[PDB]
Design a protein around this motif. Structure first.
Motif, mmCIF file in Angstrom:
data_model
loop_
_atom_site.group_PDB
_atom_site.id
_atom_site.type_symbol
_atom_site.label_atom_id
_atom_site.label_comp_id
_atom_site.label_asym_id
_atom_site.label_seq_id
_atom_site.Cartn_x
_atom_site.Cartn_y
_atom_site.Cartn_z
ATOM 1 N N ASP A 54 0.866 -1.149 0.000
ATOM 2 C CA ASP A 54 0.000 0.000 0.000
ATOM 3 C C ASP A 54 0.931 1.235 0.000
ATOM 4 O OD1 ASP A 54 -1.799 2.099 0.739
ATOM 5 O OD2 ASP A 54 -2.071 1.280 2.749
ATOM 6 N N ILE A 90 0.721 3.146 3.392
ATOM 7 C CA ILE A 90 0.891 2.324 4.600
ATOM 8 C C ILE A 90 1.562 3.122 5.722
ATOM 9 C CG2 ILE A 90 3.141 1.245 3.964
ATOM 10 C CD1 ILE A 90 0.695 -1.249 5.068
ATOM 11 N N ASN A 107 3.914 2.821 8.741
ATOM 12 C CA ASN A 107 4.977 1.972 9.235
ATOM 13 C C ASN A 107 5.073 2.216 10.738
ATOM 14 O OD1 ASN A 107 6.201 0.532 6.871
ATOM 15 N ND2 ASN A 107 6.354 2.604 6.048
ATOM 16 N N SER A 154 -3.964 1.681 6.785
ATOM 17 C CA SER A 154 -3.378 0.393 7.148
ATOM 18 C C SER A 154 -1.994 0.537 7.764
ATOM 19 C CB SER A 154 -3.344 -0.537 5.939
ATOM 20 O OG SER A 154 -4.650 -0.870 5.506
ATOM 21 N N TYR A 155 -1.650 -0.445 8.600
ATOM 22 C CA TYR A 155 -0.415 -0.453 9.389
ATOM 23 C C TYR A 155 0.309 -1.712 9.031
ATOM 24 C CZ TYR A 155 -2.877 3.054 12.083
ATOM 25 O OH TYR A 155 -3.562 4.193 12.446
ATOM 26 N N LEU A 156 1.628 -1.590 8.886
ATOM 27 C CA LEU A 156 2.507 -2.731 8.799
ATOM 28 C C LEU A 156 3.415 -2.664 10.016
ATOM 29 C CD1 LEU A 156 3.717 -5.227 7.260
ATOM 30 C CD2 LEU A 156 5.242 -3.615 6.110
ATOM 31 N N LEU A 180 -0.055 -7.145 8.883
ATOM 32 C CA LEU A 180 -0.794 -6.064 8.240
ATOM 33 C C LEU A 180 -2.092 -5.872 9.014
ATOM 34 C CD1 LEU A 180 -0.944 -4.157 5.616
ATOM 35 C CD2 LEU A 180 -2.377 -5.966 4.692
#
Ligand SMILES: COc1cc2c(cc1Nc1ncc(C(N)=O)c(Nc3c(F)cccc3C(F)(F)F)n1)CN(C)CC2
Ligand SMILES: COc1cc2c(cc1Nc1ncc(C(N)=O)c(Nc3c(F)cccc3C(F)(F)F)n1)CN(C)CC2
Lengths: 291, 293
Positions: free
Chosen positions: B4, B7, B9, B79-81, B86
């Motif tokens: 993404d 995203i 991080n 969204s988060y990684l 994920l």
């Protein structure tokens, strides 16, 4: 487990590897000589990494193994040794029609007529077994030193058959699914008559050195084929080709598969049922390679 | 390879308090969570994402959620990684799925079903206008929030199909010899967006009867029956319980031939779903029933 009859031994015990011929859809093919008989064979080698689905190679061997017809490359067995699958097949010493026409130029109408007859015989047989080639083109029609014609590279066929079985395995719950969604999961959404269209295109390829729309982007060709009242292609030069050849192209390139003739019906067609079609015509083509 | 472009991080636990596990959809698992700054509730979908994993399905799901801006599709917050996981942050829907609800309340009223069908059709009309197909419309995938609003959720099947299409198109070789019917199946898969209209019709029966038609029949046997010529599309069991307009809604949504099945837009003009008395008040009444039965 790739095949119940697989030989768990090095194929070099039986064969001397002579040279790399190149690659089809997947893997790499070697010219090789039987160490006992001196007969030439083709050995297709495919790597098998630890976490590989075997179903495609399973399906390819199964297709080759259960064919016994002169117009389909003969199968001699398979080997598994040091993570390499070797499929042993008939060797065709002149290569593909593509390899040939790229040197000789376009085939004569009679030469094309002979090729189409021999391919149709192969296709009639395959289709009688509920098999679909799905990749009929000049590159997959091989010629031996006798001028004989063989269908090769069932890689696409094998991939499709593996995909269908996977789709059936993982179809999931059907209660909310529309019938057309269920139908394409079960049946795949087309039939063997796709090969008849492909032969018609190949006939144009052999005549003109390229399929129709070869210069157009492949994704864009897919869009154009689905768009509108899409018009089937035709031979470029009207005066160079007979009424029977033009008709062969018209009928093989019937847009609707409900109306497109079978391989068996096509074998009755004037172009391919005429007298004087034999391997001699391709021997004349192979003579052009030297002279 | 990029999951993404937007995203985050960072650890989503820096920003959210995880409250409780809601369960799982097609894949992954979902938590109720509370924004530590605003106090707003969200859904956090967690999916394991190792360095050498195919990203394409999750890529496509994020892409679907991110590019929908429509009230009847679950909102997307980012969204988060973090540590090979994920986390997809979405709108939270406090009453769960219609399935969750009807398993406690029993069957929905015709008006309740009519309102749901309208709201799903609005969602579908929008998705279909964007060349998106849900492909998994059912009670379990239609969420209800505390305001009685209706949201389409779990685009997992949609994402998988879209990832497959992209891969098929990337590795389409030289298709010059392909017959038109094969080219059609390469591009479209041999069906279109009207599959979602059929699915809604089945869902309307599910809401009415607590099961889809033929739920007691083995699923392979159901597939066998559907692909036969002279398959009869299913019907509501009790004729006298339901209006002529609801019967007709079922008839038209469950049109066997997809060339003749009406679009989402055409269906929004249907008598059943164009009724003046359809609003979230009907679902507020259903949620009240859920509180003290
Ligand atoms: C002298 O013989 C050859 C020369 C050349 C070629 C093919 C042959 N002969 C040849 N005989 C048999 C087969 C077989 N049973 O499969 C085969 N397969 C093959 C391949 F060996 C390379 C590539 C593709 C394929 C295909 F399976 F698609 F046919 N090939 C291919 N040209 C591209 C370059 C020159
Ligand atoms: C109190 O709230 C809830 C209770 C319960 C559920 C779902 C919610 N709420 C809820 N809100 C938002 C979402 C979202 N943005 O996606 C969601 N997704 C979801 C899931 F969290 C679990 C499973 C499936 C899905 C789905 F994506 F398919 F919707 N769920 C699911 N029930 C099976 C049990 C009880």
């Amino acid at each position: 487990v790739v095949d119940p009859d697989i030989f768990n031994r090095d194929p070099r015990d039986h064969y001397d590897l002579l040279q790399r011929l190149g690659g089809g859809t997947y893997g790499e093919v070697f010219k090789a000589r039987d160490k006992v008989s001196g007969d030439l064979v083709a050995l297709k080698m495919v790597k098998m990494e630890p976490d590989d689905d075997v179903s495609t190679l399973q399906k390819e061997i199964l297709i080759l193994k259960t064919c016994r017809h002169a117009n389909i490359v003969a199968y001699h067995g398979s080997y598994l040794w040091l993570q390499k699958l070797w499929i042993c097949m008939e060797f065709c010493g002149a290569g593909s029609l593509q390899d040939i026409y790229q040197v000789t130029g376009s085939l004569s109408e009679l030469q094309i007529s002979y090729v189409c007859r021999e391919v149709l015989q192969g296709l009639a047989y395959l289709h009688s077994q509920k098999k679909i080639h799905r990749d009929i083109k000049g590159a997959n029609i091989l010629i031996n030193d006798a001028g004989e014609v063989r269908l090769a590279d069932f890689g696409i066929s094998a991939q499709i058959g593996a995909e269908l079985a996977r789709r059936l395995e993982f179809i999931g719950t059907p209660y909310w699914m529309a019938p057309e969604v269920a139908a394409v999961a079960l049946k795949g959404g087309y039939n063997e008559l796709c090969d008849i269209w492909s032969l018609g295109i190949t006939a144009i390829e052999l005549a003109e050195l390229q399929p129709p729309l070869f210069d157009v982007h492949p994704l864009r060709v897919l869009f154009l084929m689905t768009k509108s009242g899409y018009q089937p292609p035709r031979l470029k030069e009207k005066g160079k080709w007979s009424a029977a050849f033009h008709n062969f192209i018209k009928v093989t390139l019937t847009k609707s598969p409900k109306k497109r003739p079978s391989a068996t019906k096509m074998l009755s067609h004037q172009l391919v049922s005429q007298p004087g079609l034999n391997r001699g015509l391709i021997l004349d083509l192979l003579d052009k390679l030297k002279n």
